[PDB]
Amino acid sequence: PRGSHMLNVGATAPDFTLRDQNQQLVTLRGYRGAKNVLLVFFPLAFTGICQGELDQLRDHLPEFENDDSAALAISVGPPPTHKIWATQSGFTFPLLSDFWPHGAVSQAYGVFNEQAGIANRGTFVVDRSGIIRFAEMKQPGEVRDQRLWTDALAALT
């Protein structure tokens, strides 16, 4: 529980179990020993810079979801909201609901905007040991770079 003091590289990634857009439970620990995990926090479905960011993820998804890697997008929306958006947008990767308690996982990663009640645009790569290996927060206005995500992942083996 850290508001917006982003966790740093070398920290243990906080565990979570959240519902995806099809109401399945996704748990970060379940990847430990098996894949590196890209976590893409985003503020609000249907609006903002994050439509373009998630569209880049989509447009390069086989590079992020494979035998070595998984990608999970996280926001405060509940599953029905993420289902509709994912269907319209062509998103087939998990969108997870940090919905109730509201923003709890975003807060644990230090990427929550307490004033607005939404996640900031933070991104992490978690290795097979559960350790944060890459961390960023983008300041209002600048869009994240999906090429940098793939490069971070490629370095992890």
Residue numbers in the entry: -4 to 152
Q: What text appears in the publication on this structure?
A:
To improve protein stability during MD simulations, we realized that a re-refinement of the models of the AhpE structure was needed (see supplementary). After this re-refinement operation, we repeated the simulation with the newly refined structure for chain A and found that after 30 ns the helix α2 remained intact. Importantly, a gauche minus conformation was found for the peroxydatic Cys45 in the active site of chain A after re-refinement, which is in line with the conformation reported for most of peroxiredoxins.
